[PDB]
Amino acid sequence: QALYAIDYIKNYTHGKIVKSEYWLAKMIDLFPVAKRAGVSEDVLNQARELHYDAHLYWEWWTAENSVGFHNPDQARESLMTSISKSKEAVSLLNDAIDAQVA
Amino acid sequence: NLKPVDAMQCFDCHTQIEDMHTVGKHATVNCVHCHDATEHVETASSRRMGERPVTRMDLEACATCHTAQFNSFVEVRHESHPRLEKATPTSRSPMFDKLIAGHGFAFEHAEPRSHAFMLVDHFVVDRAYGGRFQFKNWQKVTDGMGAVRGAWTVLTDADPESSDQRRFLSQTATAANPVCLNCKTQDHILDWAYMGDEHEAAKWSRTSEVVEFARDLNHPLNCFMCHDPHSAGPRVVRDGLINAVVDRGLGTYPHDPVKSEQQGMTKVTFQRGREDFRAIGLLDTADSNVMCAQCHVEYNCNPGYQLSDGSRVGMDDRRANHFFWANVFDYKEAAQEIDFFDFRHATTGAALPKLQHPEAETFWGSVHERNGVACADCHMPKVQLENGKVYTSHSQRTPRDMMGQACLNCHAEWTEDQALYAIDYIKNYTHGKIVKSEYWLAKMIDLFPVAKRAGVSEDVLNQARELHYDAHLYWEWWTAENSVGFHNPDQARESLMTSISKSKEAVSLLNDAIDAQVA
Amino acid sequence: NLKPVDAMQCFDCHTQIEDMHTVGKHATVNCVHCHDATEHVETASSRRMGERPVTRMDLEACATCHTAQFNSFVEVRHESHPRLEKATPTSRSPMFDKLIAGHGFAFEHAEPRSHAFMLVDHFVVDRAYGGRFQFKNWQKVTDGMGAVRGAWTVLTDADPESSDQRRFLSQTATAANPVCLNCKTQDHILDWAYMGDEHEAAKWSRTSEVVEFARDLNHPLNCFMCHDPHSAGPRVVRDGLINAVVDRGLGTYPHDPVKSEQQGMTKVTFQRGREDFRAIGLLDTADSNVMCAQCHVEYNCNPGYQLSDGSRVGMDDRRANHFFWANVFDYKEAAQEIDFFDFRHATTGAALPKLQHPEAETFWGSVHERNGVACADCHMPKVQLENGKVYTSHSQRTPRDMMGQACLNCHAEWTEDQALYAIDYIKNYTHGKIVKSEYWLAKMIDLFPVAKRAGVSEDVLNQARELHYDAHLYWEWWTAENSVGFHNPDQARESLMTSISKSKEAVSLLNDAIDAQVA
Amino acid sequence: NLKPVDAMQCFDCHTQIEDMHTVGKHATVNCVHCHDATEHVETASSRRMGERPVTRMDLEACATCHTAQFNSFVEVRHESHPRLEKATPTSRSPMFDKLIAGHGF
Ligand code: HEC
Ligand code: HEC
Ligand code: HEC
Ligand code: HEC
Ligand code: HEC
Ligand code: HEC
Ligand code: HEC
Ligand code: HEC
Ligand code: HEC
Ligand code: HEC
Ligand code: HEC
Ligand code: HEC
Ligand code: HEC
Ligand code: HEC
Ligand SMILES: O=S([O-])[O-]
Ligand SMILES: O=S([O-])[O-]
Ligand SMILES: O=S([O-])[O-]
Ligand SMILES: O=S([O-])[O-]
Ligand SMILES: O=S([O-])[O-]
Ligand SMILES: O=S([O-])[O-]
Ligand SMILES: O=S([O-])[O-]
Ligand SMILES: [Ca+2]
Ligand SMILES: [Ca+2]
């Protein structure tokens, strides 16, 4: 039972780490597309400021060795923040790329 | 200590109960085991209920005389890893987030775990109630017996003062609606009209505030979902299943008219104010294929859209509670017949179906189903005892835990390791084709933004969107279905090859169109 | 399928059953579960039985609603070695044949095995029925479930045409009599008057032909031996126990009047033809010490002789069914009170007692008993489940199989190995003193022929025979008692040292007398 | 907490201890680990003990620096059956009582 409790936390936290990485990667891959579409430096810098937070609130948890066990609520809140920041950056870059196309 | 009541008094007004109770194996089981009807009897007339009697829906109402079945049911399989997200490289759908983008399952979709937890897991998953409900703490995730005693003994509500569906944490969704609960509990069996239609006698319906409904529900998988409490005979209670089998006349085995007749269902209707209210389906035989199909099917239990005009189909529409009762190769026709799709893909814009755990529809026509094997033979076999009264195990779990009873009694030519090897051959092969299907779907999906920004025509994009529907259907069936192909390995193979073919067709269409824009 | 009967009509005549059934936890359990009384009800008056109703005594009557308890009971402990003779160097009593010579146990006395087998083992042991009864073949010795279904489903009778006790093989005895069966079954509970006295309404009594009685008996350790079927409350049914505790006013705990009052017994009597016929003892609490003491006691269940004049005491005498209800140090006085001994030693000629399994009387005053521990705590513990409804294990067996529940919940300071080591320290020490007691008894016994042949006086031989009674009592208690000292290690030690002291005194007496004859 | 004593002073009288202690692998192990000699040193001469010093004989005196050896020593072998009489048919000497008669064993 105690092992099962550990695994519930680690499995849940790892799922959110993987989703955080999915969204960070989606954001990262838009940078070359935005650059080559002629998106402004102003927009790219806005996305870079979001990257700082998206990265911090993800990497803390791949760096930290307990896969959330040491503080499961904090891991959850942080990883949801990472995903939110990446999603904000994805929407910013997608809109800017689309405006360049139109 | 219980004191028996005179059932003859009740039978004067309750003739259907009389006909069931006096004939079956509960003829000697007094009503007081499950009902407190003292004030009811004092106030009722032949057509008016008067004071509402109390009916027990707790599983302990059955555990008093059937401890063995209850204990086997409530056991927690700790090897069934809990809260394990499927959208990870080590689980069922490594590219799920890209493929499902636009759907609420992107917020969380874990592997199933033991039946004791079904209602609490429904309440706490990130896609359901915006994170409103949590276990009281992270220790409680282990407590199967507590969950069975009641969800609200182990859960907390972030805001008991409001009843609206809303996000309490950012990366959650509010997909839950009242239809979901029919596959988690039947505590509401006397408070919900057939199909969840509006009804004067129903407290709850498809259009209820789901947070309020949630608070009224406690027990998972009540014992009476498969066993009539009055006759003790085999039954189903799930409205969607009765509607498919009986109302739409599709039969218990839609591909086999003979087996449908031998192993059929009889709809029994109960009234309120002499108006039809609720129904059950009595089974000809104790057929676990049909019992388990109350939940282990592909369904609608959600709002969606029409394929014809794209208009919203809300919870108020009957289509929001629907059993398709169709195998993978008949599913598209079944969705077209009700003019329905689930979501638009966030990247491709394609109208797509959302598939869920179609074990029953997958099992049809398989070698085991054709040879008269049923879910319970592999997942809740009879116990083998050197000296003891045999009973049926109710711990519904993988046969890997009980291979002697689940497989080897039939397969005498095999050792346990050989039978496990045969399972793994099928699962490994099927999973390889799922991963390849996802690779090709993802390759197609990633071409949509490239095509859009290259100026590819809407005509071409819509052609690719129509292919996306099929590529998705013929893939997602198999990540949704829990056997990783074991239940029907040839069908999985044919379907997944179809998925790959459709994606490849779309990739070639989009690549050519992008290239023509460049030249 | 059972159809319920009108219990209220029965209660018009059966007022004691009414008072028990309507109040207890079987108030909702219809009489048809255990009685077929249709013709009885048609023909009875309050003063005449009319047609005799059928009463079910099979354990399956209870297993329908209490499968967990039934299955735990019927389980066979294969580690309890079967048909293992105690008179061997590797068992409990290496010198038993020399010491017991003249008694029927010299023909066979095996170690106990699982409760499922008690009636069949009683029927087939070489000392009981002259070898008349056998298992149908040697494979049937494994079949606990079959024995529980009924003895005559697994046994054969060498001569169904005769009913006399006789030898069918040379080295057998015919020690069985009707009193024995009271500790193997209660199938005869409605056919046997209290104590087995003659009664117009009793088919069977102490003086019946035991072979005929045997053929009418089927089930071992009926569930109702400890649980009243009407109230579901705790009870005993064994006449000899009720006689000791209630009739003779000894109390449930003869050494503790306070515990006797708190944990007492109430005698309830049933009549036939308005004369007392049978009785039960309702317990104040669910006290396994007293439930198990229905059988695990020292008793008379046999003819014997008077200490006063040596005259025969036959089965017709009340003393042939007797619970001494006395510890080892009170037993000689208890036997003097009824003027009784069992056999004359074949070699020494001494009047001797025969002791059997005095677990209950040994447990009194021990550290565990004084601390309120009871047999069930160590031998029938509650089951421990991660998730499940708790019930009481009915697999009455050594705590070595379930040390976590039997010992270590109380003894938190110990590991399993430490607790086992503590058991073994006691058993090893006690067994060593048993072996030394047998060495000295055997030395004394062997001097009797030497003394007789040397012309030693009858006066000296009689003084030695008096010592033999004590040397025997204070040894045999401990080969008869099954815990090898664990139940009361200080008492075992004191007693076995007394045995050795007595034997040494007799050896000295005889050696001196022989030496004086030679001089 | 132990406070070391001046071993050189002890050696002014205890020459055999000096020759043993200063040469071996306990040359750095202070006498206070095993002796309480405060009043002894105050009252002794080379020819009179004075107050008797306390000497520790408990095994914990060594276990402080040699826990591994101490723990391996104190372990109980539960498989070495306890209080098992040798004069039984299943032990070492089945006829021991007859053969040893007259002896305390
Ligand atoms: C006629 C005077 C009645 C007697 C006697 C009993 N009941 Fe009844 N009951 C009656 C009516 C008219 C209704 C409304 C439904 C209908 O058939 O028209 C009911 C309802 C119930 C229910 C359902 C309660 C709910 O929550 O929906 C139960 C469980 C019930 N009744 C049980 C019951 C029992 C156990 C009785 C004997 C003690 C009994 N009823 C007497 C009418 C009458
Ligand atoms: C004791 C008072 C009972 C309560 C409460 C419940 N059941 Fe029962 N059940 C009971 C008996 C005596 C029997 C007959 C046993 C036999 O084999 O003859 C039954 C039977 C069932 C069966 C088997 C029915 C069949 O094979 O036709 C089922 C599936 C069953 N019972 C289920 C059940 C459920 C789900 C209960 C809670 C709602 C329940 N029983 C209560 C005794 C008692
Ligand atoms: C005593 C010194 C403890 C040790 C060692 C461990 N745990 Fe613990 N745990 C302890 C307390 C007092 C609490 C809070 C209890 C309460 O109900 O208030 C906990 C909590 C947990 C939880 C829940 C955490 C949450 O965030 O809600 C889990 C899953 C848990 N403990 C598990 C656990 C495991 C697996 C341990 C060994 C690695 C462990 N705990 C050590 C007390 C102590
Ligand atoms: C019966 C037709 C069902 C309806 C309606 C709903 N669910 Fe379900 N659910 C069902 C089964 C048979 C299973 C187990 C098999 C599987 O593939 O998982 C489930 C599982 C869940 C789980 C646990 C796994 C997970 O996805 O995290 C949750 C959290 C869950 N279901 C939630 C849920 C919600 C929110 C529903 C309404 C939108 C819903 N379910 C409907 C059967 C059925
Ligand atoms: C459907 C998913 C089921 C639920 C929920 C419950 N049971 Fe069940 N039960 C099920 C099957 C398929 C069978 C075997 C039918 C066959 O003949 O093959 C059973 C059997 C019973 C029985 C009969 C005795 C036995 O075979 O063990 C009893 C008494 C019974 N089940 C009780 C029971 C209880 C108490 C439940 C809730 C804990 C329960 N069942 C749930 C299918 C289903
Ligand atoms: C034996 C011939 C089977 C029959 C009949 C059914 N299923 Fe099955 N199932 C089977 C296997 C070998 C597996 C894989 C198990 C493994 O450990 O690899 C499965 C899997 C499931 C699962 C997922 C179980 C898990 O992963 O823990 C579910 C939910 C499941 N099966 C349900 C199910 C239903 C509802 C059936 C009747 C329609 C059914 N199975 C039949 C073997 C067999
Ligand atoms: C009065 C008209 C009676 C009614 C109604 C019932 N019984 Fe009876 N019973 C009656 C008598 C006079 C006797 C003889 C014993 C006595 O008390 O004098 C009995 C006996 C029984 C027995 C014991 C049978 C035996 O083997 O000794 C049983 C088990 C019994 N009765 C059960 C019973 C039941 C279940 C009834 C309702 C269906 C019932 N009896 C009605 C008098 C009367
Ligand atoms: C189902 C129709 C039953 C049959 C046949 C038997 N018993 Fe029973 N028993 C039954 C119920 C519903 C209950 C109450 C359960 C509760 O906890 O509320 C009982 C209870 C018992 C008990 C416990 C009594 C107590 O006071 O704690 C015992 C010891 C018991 N039952 C024994 C028993 C025996 C020996 C039976 C065969 C003669 C038997 N029961 C039949 C349901 C049923
Ligand atoms: C209750 C007071 C009893 C009476 C009367 C009889 N027996 Fe018994 N027997 C009893 C117990 C508690 C045990 C188990 C503990 C033990 O020391 O063995 C037994 C055991 C047997 C056995 C099996 C062991 C053996 O000796 O081979 C047999 C064959 C047996 N008993 C036969 C028997 C006969 C023939 C009796 C009447 C002369 C007799 N028993 C009476 C409890 C009681
Ligand atoms: C098949 C080639 C067999 C092998 C190998 C073994 N046994 Fe057997 N056994 C066999 C038969 C056909 C019979 C007679 C069956 C009948 O019901 O008539 C038996 C009998 C036994 C018995 C009963 C002996 C008796 O005298 O009544 C026992 C205890 C038995 N067998 C055990 C047994 C064991 C332990 C074996 C492996 C060493 C074994 N048998 C081999 C068929 C065959
Ligand atoms: C005396 C030797 C017993 C016999 C024979 C049977 N049971 Fe029993 N039972 C016994 C004890 C000491 C207890 C526990 C009492 C306590 O409260 O500590 C029990 C308990 C039961 C119960 C209650 C539920 C539980 O605790 O498990 C039931 C339903 C019960 N026993 C049933 C039962 C049946 C069916 C038997 C025949 C197979 C049976 N018991 C025999 C003592 C004795
Ligand atoms: C725990 C404190 C105990 C209580 C209370 C009772 N007994 Fe016991 N018993 C106990 C032990 C440790 C042993 C030796 C088991 C071993 O494997 O070494 C015993 C032994 C028995 C036996 C013989 C069992 C066997 O050898 O398989 C019997 C028949 C027995 N005990 C009966 C018994 C009765 C009737 C009790 C209440 C009066 C009783 N025991 C109390 C531990 C405990
Ligand atoms: C001369 C002035 C001494 C000094 C400085 C110390 N000790 Fe001594 N010790 C002395 C004498 C004359 C004796 C009597 C034995 C003898 O050799 O004639 C002792 C005895 C001891 C003993 C043994 C005590 C016993 O129980 O027999 C010990 C352990 C001892 N002494 C230790 C000791 C230590 C540790 C000193 C330095 C702190 C020390 N002694 C000083 C004479 C003198
Ligand atoms: C710490 C303050 C120590 C106390 C108290 C004891 N001993 Fe010791 N011992 C100590 C050291 C630092 C060493 C040298 C380790 C090395 O390998 O360099 C030792 C050595 C031993 C040895 C080995 C001697 C050899 O020649 O190989 C033994 C056998 C030994 N020690 C035993 C021992 C005993 C029995 C003690 C209690 C009377 C004891 N030591 C105390 C450090 C310390
Ligand atoms: O018997 S029911 O239909 O009231
Ligand atoms: O959401 S449920 O269908 O798995
Ligand atoms: O109720 S009984 O005593 O007939
Ligand atoms: O009360 S009786 O004697 O009919
Ligand atoms: O013979 S019985 O008492 O062991
Ligand atoms: O050094 S010792 O001999 O005093
Ligand atoms: O050397 S001593 O005698 O002081
Ligand atoms: Ca769906
Ligand atoms: Ca006796």
Swiss-Prot record, chain A:
Heme 8 binds at residue 70. Besides, it may lower the pKa of the Tyr hydroxyl group. It comes from the Bacteria. It is found in: Periplasm. Disulfide bonds: none annotated. Belongs to the cytochrome c-552 family. Homohexamer. Dimer of trimers. Catalyzes the reduction of nitrite to ammonia, consuming six electrons in the process. Has very low activity toward hydroxylamine. Has even lower activity toward sulfite. Sulfite reductase activity is maximal at neutral pH. This is Cytochrome c-552. It comes from Thioalkalivibrio nitratireducens (strain DSM 14787 / UNIQEM 213 / ALEN2). The chain holds residues 450 to 551 of 553 of the full protein.
